[PDB]
Symmetry: none
Subunit: 165 residues, 2 copies
């Protein structure tokens, strides 16, 4: 009810000689009207509550959009048609070095057991050679053990001794 | 803004056919004040509510803006080759990766095996001074042998023993 439309009811109960019927029906008006605006008000608090929620969800949307926009603006910064196919000038400036630095490595351990086929061959040689050396040293110092004692002074034994040292 | 039960038990204090007039005026005043309050607070809620209505139209238009812009960017990127471009960056980084891998493993068994074949350059050494010793001792032996073949007299017991050794 309007502000005026209320007052016009309130200043008609002011008369204490008001017929009980008119009184009861005026009070009825007050009741249904007050009920009506309680209902309306509550509806407005529920509706206002709705907008407040939608506002809470539309903000989160907007924000997300901004983010999704930002990245999408910088993704489009990555070259038109020239920087595109420049990358393929990279992908096989790499595929080159990719095989070159695995062809040369694979080779380098071809060098690994090219090198072992002789470092284990040069152990087979370093031992039998030392065996022969040891043999001739054995003979040498048998002979040399004999060339002692008789130092006092056979000419022939003196030239052999001269050979021994 | 009193609850409707209170409004009601007020409304019961007005149907009394001959209530004290002062109480009647008091009641009606109560009603008018309460209604004034209800109206004002409702006008406040109407003000606030109308506000949200406005900032809902502003935000709805903003989204409609952003969305469009987004599409635009997603189209400009896509028309400039986005799927093929990134697909190259998928390969560039992969190749960089395994190339790095093989640079690493190469760097290692190029490190620890010219680190390995100083041994040859040592072993070789070992097989040529030893050799020398051999070819040295032998020499001397054969030298003595020649001296024993340069003897006119029959082998004196000592020289006979030495000659007897000189078989190998």
């Amino acid at each position: 009810l309007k502000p005026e439309e209320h007052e016009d009811i309130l200043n008609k109960l002011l008369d204490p000689e008001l017929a009980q019927s008119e009184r009861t029906e005026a009070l009825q008006q007050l009741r249904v009207n007050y009920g009506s605006f309680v209902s309306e008000y509550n509806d407005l608090t529920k509706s206002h509550a709705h907008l407040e929620r939608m506002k809470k969800n539309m903000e989160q949307t907007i924000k997300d959009l901004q983010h999704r926009l930002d990245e999408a603006e910088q993704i489009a910064l990555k070259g038109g048609k020239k920087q595109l196919q420049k990358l393929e000038a990279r992908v096989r400036e790499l595929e080159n070095e990719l095989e070159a630095e695995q062809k040369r490595n694979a080779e380098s351990v071809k060098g690994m057991r090219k090198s072992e086929r002789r470092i284990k061959e040069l152990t087979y040689q370093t031992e039998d050679l030392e065996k022969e050396r040891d043999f001739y040293f054995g003979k040498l110092r048998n002979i040399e053990l004999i060339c002692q004692e008789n130092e006092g002074n056979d000419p022939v034994l003196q030239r052999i001794v001269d050979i021994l040292y």
